[PDB]
Amino acid sequence: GEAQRRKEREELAQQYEAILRECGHGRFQWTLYFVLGLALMADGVEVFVVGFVLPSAEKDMCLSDSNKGMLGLIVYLGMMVGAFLWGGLADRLGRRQCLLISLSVNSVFAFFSSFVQGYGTFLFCRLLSGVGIGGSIPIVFSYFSEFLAQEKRGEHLSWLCMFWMIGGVYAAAMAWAIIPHYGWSFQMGSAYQFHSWRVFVLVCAFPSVFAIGALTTQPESPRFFLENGKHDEAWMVLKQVHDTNMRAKGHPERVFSVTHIKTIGVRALSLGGQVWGNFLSCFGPEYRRITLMMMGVWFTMSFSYYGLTVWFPDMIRHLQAVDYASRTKVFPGERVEHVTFNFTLENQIHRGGQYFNDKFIGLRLKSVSFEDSLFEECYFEDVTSSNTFFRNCTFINTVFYNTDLFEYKFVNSRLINSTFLHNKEGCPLDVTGTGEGAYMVYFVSFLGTLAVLPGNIVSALLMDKIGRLRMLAGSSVMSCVSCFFLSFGNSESAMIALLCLFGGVSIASWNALDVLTVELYPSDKRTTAFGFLNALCKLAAVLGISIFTSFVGITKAAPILFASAALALGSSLALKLPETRGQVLQ
Amino acid sequence: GEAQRRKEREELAQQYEAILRECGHGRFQWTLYFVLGLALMADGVEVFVVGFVLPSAEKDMCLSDSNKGMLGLIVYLGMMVGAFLWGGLADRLGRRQCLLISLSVNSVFAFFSSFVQGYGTFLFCRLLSGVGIGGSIPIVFSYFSEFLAQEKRGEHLSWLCMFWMIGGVYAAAMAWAIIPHYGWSFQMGSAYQFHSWRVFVLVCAFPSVFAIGALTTQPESPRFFLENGKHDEAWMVLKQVHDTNMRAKGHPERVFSVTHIKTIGVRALSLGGQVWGNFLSCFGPEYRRITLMMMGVWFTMSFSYYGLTVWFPDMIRHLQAVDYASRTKVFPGERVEHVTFNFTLENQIHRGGQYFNDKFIGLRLKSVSFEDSLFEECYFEDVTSSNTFFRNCTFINTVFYNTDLFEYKFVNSRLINSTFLHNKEGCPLDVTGTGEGAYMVYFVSFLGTLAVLPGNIVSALLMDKIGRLRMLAGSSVMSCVSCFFLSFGNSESAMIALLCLFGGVSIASWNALDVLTVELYPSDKRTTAFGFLNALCKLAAVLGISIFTSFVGITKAAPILFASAALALGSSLALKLPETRGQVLQ
């Protein structure tokens, strides 16, 4: 019974590999490579949009705390749902069909998010865009694997991981070239406003549309047809692959020699039942040790990588904040009287001042604090305030005309006979401000990805030469050693170098994990299992981000120990996995 | 009302601390340190006796399954009752009074257990010995804390755990030096027998007697007298402390400068009511968050620690059992006839044999199984049987002379005209049996405690330097990381190293928890609350042991996940506790 099933699946796999050797590589494989690289580029772009627009988003939607912290977790949760959903649906509907549906959903909801003005609606649109793009990596890898021969199956799959990095580079470049133009205030409707970050979101929603356009021209994988008892169109697809390959070779004169490939409301409930059957069969007697080791490896690597990747920029920001706090100026004791006096003062503290009959017209305040001051018959006009506070201050007969000094900028103050007139529009809470730091953020991201590059090249070249397990274990161990090396970092330059090193060493491990998870599952459960594991990866990413953003400024022992321990456990479970190099893809 | 009570308690605490600073440290504090360390040594010794004597105990009391599994739970339940009882009674009768009572109870019932011959009576005696020793740690910590000044209150209390450490070493040494002499068969009465494990139990009951002898010479804590409205003898005790301290210094000429100190069946029933009230008042408006966080931390830490600590030796035993089974031999089909044939065969299976007129004189059988055999006019003499069975066997005209082949060793057998003569004395049920493994058990226990040592030293040195909460949380997190590291264990050596690591990392956390629970309760509820929490610790120990002994041989994921989750929850609730370093003991 079950033995017969396994046997027949075995000669099916062998015959399919023979047909693939007959067809060979050439134009078809590379064409599909680029076509799927567009979807991976979209996946890579999607994880940078909210991170890049949080400043402007909180400016134009008046976002408080616990709202900026949810806008990254929203995309990660969206991918967590979408990966599982589309991975489950791909084994019953098809790789190309589900990829088209998911990419279309992503594009539509990304456009809609680009045009949303509210916050809750923005959360919903971002979550659904993440759902749409969540099933990109599983379907792409499981769809490209079914067109590659046994020989160079690792190198030909590892070159497919350049596109995530290219998407990251694209996002960084567009953010640098679009967002810095804060002047843009395109108007459509009194109640609504359109700034430049919306344009950035639009441009970052573009490449998914190109992915759909390229994918509509590609044929469904023959293996999916063969599994589901559909023989004729599988043969047609294989013939198309052969014809394209040989026309590209220049001998477009031979004929495909294969005639045949040996073959062995209510609707919603049926689909649910079938998907649950596939998911449970993933937890079968045949697939249990492999499944659990894969779960462990995916979870640990995701936790460590995402935790450190979010930790490095936060630590850079913290070091800059410490420098700023160290440079401040203090002016203890002042007595200014009867003068019109503006200024553009930044990063200052005034204590013990006594101001009488002073006119403050047209001044910019950035990180300026007045403490223990007294203002008496003063006058504030055209005051622009950023990170400015009044603590232990007393105001007597003062007038605030055309100022943004809201109620939250007076901390434990006392106003007597004070008048507020023509208050500027603004947030009811400190929303902080990001200025010149954006350029350095973009530069840091670009450096991270460029550091990723050499590991990609080396892993792609040596994946077949040394092996999947050797690559995975080697890169995991090197990453753990780097995690130890994070102790020797206390400046921005050192943190950038550490980011570069860790990003450059972990990518080989991720490449090996992708190829491994491709090769250890049969063609009737590849997308389901690999999508489930990628959903677990996204959940671990959420957990790791939450855990690692809490150690910035406390100590550097907790991040190092957590990352090193998780990576060591991941390498330990990775060394127990079966070897799949030199094996027919079955 | 209540505010006045809190205030007056406050200046009482402040004046008491001033008096303690005036008295200082010296000979009195170290003398009391050793005196209470004897009681902690007794506590440490008590938890090894049944574990060390279960082999010999089941040999000489014929213990079945469900009886060896209850002889550990009996001591844990005894301590669970005793901790609560003596902690409750200590706040109404006194620390030294209740410690004397509990230690005497422990000693008496330990001697009686040493001389018991039955099982039920042995259960009762061990349970009451556990009850006697249950209130050791609460009263000892809460009694020593009331003689220490603010300055080094953490260091001087953390040195108090080297004692439970050594007790373990003492128990291991005595077990190694006493039990291996199985020859000892001291006889007193025909129906009763005295082996060497009884001598071991006697020697392990000794140190409680020394604890009582040393405790009878120490004075009651002044704080207990001051709380209960008794002023004169509190002043006398403080004067004694001062006099001893200054005589030790070498200046026995100064005078105690303190003259006045601020002061705040039916009998048994009243005391019980008072205890109940104190406990309910713990479910006080002032102490409800603290109480619940303490409950959670104690329960989780006890569950994890005890579960893993019982899991490690069980896993070692399981690995040894697997190795032994992997050594097995099968001899299918035999025909032996007309020969005198002994042997010393271990771990074998004979199937399909046919024996005719065979004499079996003086053979040792260990883990030997005869299946589908036929014995005809056979003769068994001086047969020693261990884990030996006869299944689906037929005996015809066979004689069993001077053999221990009892009725339970013939499984679904058929005897025809068989004769049993001069059967050896022995159990009516299988008892298995432990030989050389005892030395390795003792060595493993010794290694565990020696691994505990460095954590003790470091915690004692750094308790004041870093803080109680930092120490607790740090050690809890490291313990969780170790729980993750239990994945890398598959041999006896690896399991021993893992036991050493986990024991070495959890002890700082336990030290910090003890000191913390000492310092967050007022002197009129210290013993009640701390004893209630220690009773909860023992109940959690029972639950954790029962849960964790069921995962041995199934998988290593359930233990790791349970322990890590519980320790993470414990650390989470530990980080929310108030800081008590740099605070007057109130």
Ligand SMILES: CC[C@@H](C(N)=O)N1CCCC1=O
């Ligand atoms: C280029 C790396 C890429 C991969 N396929 O390994 N990565 C890294 C983490 C998430 C992801 O898709």
Ligand SMILES: CC[C@@H](C(N)=O)N1CCCC1=O
């Ligand atoms: C002597 C240490 C003692 C304590 N009170 O901290 N321990 C450690 C593990 C369980 C226990 O009671």
